[PDB]
Amino acid sequence: DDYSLVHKNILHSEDLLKYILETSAYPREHEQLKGLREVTEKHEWSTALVPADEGLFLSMLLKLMNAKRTIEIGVYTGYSLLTTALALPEDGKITAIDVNKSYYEIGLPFIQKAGVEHKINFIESEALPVLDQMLEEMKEEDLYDYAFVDADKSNYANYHERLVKLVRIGGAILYDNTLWFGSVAYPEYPGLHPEEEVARLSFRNLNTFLAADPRVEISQVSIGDGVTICRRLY
Amino acid sequence: DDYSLVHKNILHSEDLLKYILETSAYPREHEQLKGLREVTEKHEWSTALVPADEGLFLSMLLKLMNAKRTIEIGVYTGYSLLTTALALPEDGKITAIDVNKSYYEIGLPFIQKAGVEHKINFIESEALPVLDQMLEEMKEEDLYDYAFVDADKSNYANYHERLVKLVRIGGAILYDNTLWFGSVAYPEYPGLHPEEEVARLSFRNLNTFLAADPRVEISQVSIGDGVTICRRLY
Ligand SMILES: Nc1ncnc2c1ncn2[C@@H]1O[C@H](CSCC[C@H](N)C(=O)O)[C@@H](O)[C@H]1O
Ligand SMILES: Nc1ncnc2c1ncn2[C@@H]1O[C@H](CSCC[C@H](N)C(=O)O)[C@@H](O)[C@H]1O
Ligand SMILES: Oc1ccc(CCNCc2ccc(O)c(O)c2)cc1
Ligand SMILES: [Mg+2]
Ligand SMILES: [Mg+2]
Question: Record-annotated residues binding S-adenosyl-L-methionine (chains A, B)?
Fold first, then answer.
């Protein structure tokens, strides 16, 4: 491993995190989500995997807002993507974007056996070109209800400017890792990989920008590695 | 000096929580919410106050699900109540319940100055008798969209049995403090005040029960002191 923060928790002990997962997450986790998580935990990049308790939170948000059309930026093996597909109705639709389809192929068998692959349109590409072509093509009747952003960390602010125009008014945009293992809380943080430090500063700037952005109402939630929920106002 | 958990938090550092509050919560806090909070912080029971980052999270949930009729169990000085009243549409209605209206009159001037007191029907009573009386008069078209539970901790299970019938299908029930300062993570916990130990054992039982309850979907969110979101399935 080259990164420095992968094992740091934002809760005060591993025992508390394990209590949550063992008591409230794992018993509610779909069988195909469990299988996808177990394979992914063996992968070299398992650090980026969305945790099980955050997954149930994302699923709860989708259902309470009755989302039907979503976009997912940053798929990896597809844990949050499968979570989103399982939450949506039978005729829901998802646009999933990732640069590395081979990651998606790892979790695709579990997605298929869950019987929800028909809801997914997977696009193997960088997100910004796809988002720009979406804005050139999108009609007002096609705007998304929900957007989950979990890709290139230093590019969140760029995704934001596109997504505030691609989600409906009252729709939700969620940014993953906005607390970045807790390292955002200080002006400086020693011992980090160079691109770990770029992400840290990018999130510090992003969090300040989102709090002042009048186009949205926000809520930063200390779940997982930190999730910031945005709701488009106009 | 009499209760043991009051100086504990579930995040790994006070600095991270301060970062969240200062970066994301306080800049989005209504001026009357800021006033109610700052007078409450000088009250003897200020430890029971719903924090600012959790308050914005409740506000986000209410708007994303388009809540109109809500019920609030456990008001205290009214921070979460005022948060709810400011999040609902102008025609929103709240049933607020608390055994001690003296606490409520600490925050009522801020609720009035915010211009939202017209949304609130306050009932000075124990919660259970009111909920039982609601079960006899409730009409199917009068079910609540949303319920925030934050009263006597040892009675949450009794509240749940009423609320899964008073909240509409697809409505939300939120239980505050379900992580109880992290103390629920161990079967035995040392040196608590007898009432803190009763609440701890009550939350351990409630968390296990809710995870197995087929009437609801759940998400335990490690925000504040832990909030368990329930969604009624039938
Ligand atoms: N510019 C870019 N455009 C689209 N995807 C990108 C990208 N840069 C990196 N990514 C992808 O973003 C992913 C981040 S890991 C995301 C984890 C996933 N949300 C889960 O539920 O586990 C990686 O798979 C990486 O391939
Ligand atoms: N049996 C009961 N029925 C109704 N309220 C009760 C109760 N037992 C205790 N309470 C009330 O529940 C409250 C818990 S403190 C609640 C904090 C409040 N939700 C906030 O936003 O800050 C106390 O005010 C207490 O008076
Ligand atoms: O009967 C009790 C139970 C617990 C205590 C100590 C904890 N203080 C209460 C508290 C703390 C945080 C909250 O969010 C809340 O609703 C309430 C004291 C008397
Ligand atoms: Mg992530
Ligand atoms: Mg509470």
Answer: 50, 72, 74-75, 80, 98, 127, 152
Helix H or strand E segment including A108: helix A101-113
Put simply, the answer to whether A10 touches B9 (Cβ < 8 Å) is no
Beta partners for B227?
B176, B221
Rounded CA-CA distance B5/B75 in Å is 21
- DSSP letter assigned to residue B11: B
Q: Looking at chain B, list the stretches that DSSP marks H as alpha helix, in order from N- to C-terminal side.
A: 14-20, 31-40, 52-64, 79-87, 101-113, 127-137, 156-166, 194-212
Residue pair B136/B108 in contact by the 8 Å Cβ criterion: no
Residue A180 contacts residue A5 (beta carbons within 8 Å): yes
The tokens describing B230, both together, are 């329930």
Q: Which two tokens mark A167?
A: 């989600």
**Are the beta carbons of B193 and B144 closer than 8 angstroms?**
no
- Write down the experimental method used for this entry: X-ray
Q: Alpha-carbon distance A59 to A79, whole Å? A: 11
Choose among A19, A65, A210: nearest Cβ to B184.
Answer: A19
Residue with tokens 């691109």: A195
Query: Residue B177 in contact with residue B207, Cβ under 8 Å?
Result: no
CB neighbours of residue A209 within 10 Å: 12
d(CA B88, CA B202): 31
Is B74 labelled as part of a ligand binding site? yes
| Residues 61-100 in A contacting B (C-alpha not used; CB under 8 Å) | 61, 63-66
Count CB atoms within 10 A of the CB of residue A210.
25
User: Class of the B14-232 domain?
Assistant: alpha beta
- Resolution of the experimental model in angstroms, please? 2.2
